[PDB]
Amino acid sequence: HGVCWIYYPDGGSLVGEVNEDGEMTGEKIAYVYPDERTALYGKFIDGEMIEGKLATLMSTEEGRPHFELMPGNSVYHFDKSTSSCISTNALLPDPYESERVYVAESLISSAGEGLFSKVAVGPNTVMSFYNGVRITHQEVDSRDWALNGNTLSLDEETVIDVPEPYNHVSKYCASLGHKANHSFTPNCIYDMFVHPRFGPIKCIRTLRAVEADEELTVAYGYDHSPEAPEWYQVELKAFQATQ
């Protein structure tokens, strides 16, 4: 009975007893979110989630965790996106994200919908996930801006996107990172995240304390000249003329 905890740089972790081979394989393995309380407990094979049920890490004694299942039939599994598939269940929300953010009309004029915090949290808090289909930089950079409203660079090889009609919450709510609007004085940043369901993606993490019902914003970081959507260039000029 040698319990192992594997923590990712983002704060999440994998915990459980390894098999004879030394791999996270069994019916009692769990992924614990960055709040070190919300968890997905169940069947995992070599650390990969096969059937995780929503649970709560009640306590830990000498490294041994005690989980209690949450009511309901909420099960999740590794479901990495491809270039054409965003999710096997687009309407199944993420439990950790669901308790921290919500979509509403943005406070930014003519910005459509925005992402808002459900709670007061301190600096460096993961609030939302930015999952989407995986496409190349060439495909993205070689097409009109009209189609790049939700593109986010993951790494040098991959760009995450939430293309129509998934940009509508009625069509896709597995993750909500794409709903955060831009600001040159953002309260959040896009950060790397290793998700048990979405795999390697990015998350929205606070830069500082945020209050309940405060709109979450991130700096989109488009190239600037002392190419970007017109609305962006406009706000850029307006920003330079205050401060």
């Binding site: 930089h137 790049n148 986010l152 660079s153 760009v159 950060d191 700096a219 989109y220 970081g221």
Partner: peptide
């Protein structure tokens, strides 16, 4: 040229 968000 890069038409995606970056950080």
């Amino acid at each position: 040229i890069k038409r995606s968000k970056k950080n």
